[PDB]
């Protein structure tokens, strides 16, 4: 037995323009970055650097 | 020398965040500009025994 | 603006996008060249 849930909400217009967001590691963690050119998404990188 | 795409602005859309639909209010009055950079494409391959 | 029609029979939702033709065909030519490697 399936049914739906409907919510009626106010409909204001807002300005909408995506801002770059950076992710940063929590204490105890680090991010390894693959610096190989043309990495292709999987497998080994032979040039690895560490960033927060 | 300009490829022009025809576009429409819609109010009833499907949601990318989950199964369901949502209705949005009618469009704002005018001069709406969206200048942007194409930085990549998402393609799928149509193969098969044929 | 100057797109105020609301109905055809009983245009506010009409919009368009421009792409430089020469950039797009060049872009695809490079993509195609890479697809050909596979």
């Amino acid at each position, epitope marked *: 037995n399936c049914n739906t849930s*409907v919510i*009626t909400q*106010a*409909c204001p217009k807002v300005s909408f323009e995506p801002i770059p967001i950076h992710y940063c590691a929590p204490a105890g963690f680090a991010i390894l970055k693959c610096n190989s050119k043309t990495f292709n998404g999987s497998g080994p990188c032979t040039n690895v650097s560490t960033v927060q | 020398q300009n490829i022009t795409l025809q576009c*429409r*602005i*819609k*109010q*009833i*859309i499907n949601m990318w965040q989950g199964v369901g*639909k949502a*209705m949005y*209010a*009618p469009p704002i009055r005018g001069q709406i500009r969206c200048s942007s950079n194409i930085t990549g494409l998402l393609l799928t391959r149509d193969g098969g025994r044929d | 603006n100057n797109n105020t029609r*609301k*109905s055809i*029979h*009983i245009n506010i*939702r009409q919009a368009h996008c421009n792409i430089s033709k020469a950039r797009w065909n060049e872009t695809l030519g490079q993509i195609v060249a890479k697809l050909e490697e596979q």
Partner: antibody
Amino acid sequence: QVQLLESGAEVKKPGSSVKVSCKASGDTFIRYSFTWVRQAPGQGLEWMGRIITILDVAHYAPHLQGRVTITADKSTSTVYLELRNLRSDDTAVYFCAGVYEGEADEGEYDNNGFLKHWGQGTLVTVT
Amino acid sequence: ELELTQSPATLSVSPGERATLSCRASESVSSDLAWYQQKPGQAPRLLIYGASTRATGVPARFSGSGSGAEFTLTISSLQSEDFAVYYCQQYNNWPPRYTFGQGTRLEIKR
């Protein structure tokens, strides 16, 4: 664009239910919204509620929802107004009205409330 | 929700006179107030779509405007066929809480 054809008059003992129908013709029912108006004698145009046929949702005047529901039967292009627990207070001439919405099927629905297409008016009383 | 009221209860005019009808909105409705014409035994047919667009089929005699708490409807060169009750309707509601005013009756001066 369309004409709306309503059911006839009815009388019920208070507490009984009454269902009023409004059939639309000349366009696709799904394409646009319908509302109901209650012309009680001596009164103005009390709003009953609104039903959207592209999305099966409805809204009701805030004092009436305990008694009234609206159903859009897309297969018969007919809207039904159901009055539960009918009171003598609800004696009135009821009718539907349609509002054209653009290309609702394509998701270009306007959500207009301006009533252009009207029914005839059916008196509902109690006994 | 928003209450709409008519200024005159009725308005007595002569045919050929310009009718001047008005409606007040207690919550400052914005460009969401429509006008309708109801004749006895008839549905209250739309005259003005939104605050100022006459609906298709509406005679050029009918026009109106307004904003916020006050809106008007006028009928130039009023004809005998226009002695109807005019209604005020508001749409600035979401969730919908649409309302109508009481209706102003035109009277034929006699």
